[PDB]
């Protein structure tokens, strides 16, 4: 009942996510895109998308029409949950709207290594020196979010932790404009309750794992901000380019 819980969540998460971390480790080892050079060469194969322009709107362009891809998932995702569907549509509609830039920097974390990330459905491998090479302020865009994932990745949970982890980041009782917050704060007191006896099971030796990945959660709503400025920034001083429409809205004088 708790169990079970747990369970149909993880079944969630993996029939709604193409790419998760058992699918990311295993890869992690293809096509490496290091320079302007490498880049081209992927461009013939696996971005097929702004098929020219300068180089960084090209590669962010890539990398906005992958978080569209998961904000998608996260969607299907969420409406799996038991209880969301439940919701008047509109409390479901804000929980997204609010919610799904801080999962996906949670999941960026398991496309991720020290060196770089991986992109194009796994099958190319962009370098985190690479994209700190790229002029400003394209080069401040990724930086924080291998600082948050190298984190992260270092408490070593695997998909069934992050499934519930992704869950509660979603059923979140604080987004501005809900309707039913107490029924909502309830979904969130469920998840995070098998969150921890989950973790207590699958990683007893670290007594105070369910602690620090709810300070992620504190972290990722901090990184979610200093992210819709710096977007904000590039919107201003760059318009060679074109932001995403959805994530204009998704942005917008929320934080
Ligand atoms: C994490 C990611 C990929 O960050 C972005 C960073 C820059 C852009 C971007 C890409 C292309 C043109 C832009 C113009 C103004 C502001 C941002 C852009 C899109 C997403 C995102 O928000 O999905």
Do not use: W
Request: with cysteine.
């Amino acid at each position: 009942d708790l169990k079970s819980l747990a369970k149909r969540i993880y079944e969630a998460y993996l029939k709604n996510f193409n790419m998760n971390k058992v699918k990311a480790r295993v890869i992690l080892s293809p096509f490496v895109i290091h320079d302007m050079e490498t880049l081209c060469m992927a461009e013939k194969t696996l971005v097929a998308k702004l098929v020219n322009k300068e180089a960084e709107v090209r590669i962010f362009h890539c990398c906005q029409c992958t978080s569209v891809e998961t904000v998608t998932e996260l969607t299907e995702f969420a409406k799996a949950i038991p209880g969301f569907a439940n919701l008047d549509l509109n409390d479901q509609v804000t929980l997204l709207k609010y919610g799904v830039y801080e999962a996906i920097f949670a999941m960026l974390s398991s496309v991720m290594n020290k060196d770089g990330m991986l992109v194009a459905y796994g099958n190319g491998f962009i370098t985190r020196e690479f994209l700190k090479s790229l002029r400003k302020p394209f080069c401040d865009i990724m930086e924080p979010k291998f600082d948050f994932a190298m984190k992260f990745n270092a408490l070593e949970l695997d998909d069934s932790d992050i499934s519930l982890f992704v869950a509660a980041i979603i059923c979140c009782g604080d987004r501005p404009g809900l309707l039913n917050v107490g029924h909502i704060e309830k979904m969130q007191e469920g998840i995070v309750h098998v969150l921890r006896l989950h973790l207590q099971s699958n990683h007893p030796d670290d007594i105070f794992l369910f602690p620090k990945l709810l300070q992620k959660m504190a972290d990722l709503r901090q990184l979610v901000t200093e992210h819709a400025q710096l977007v904000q920034i590039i919107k201003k001083t760059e318009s060679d380019a074109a932001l995403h429409p959805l994530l204009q809205e998704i942005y917008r004088d929320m934080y």
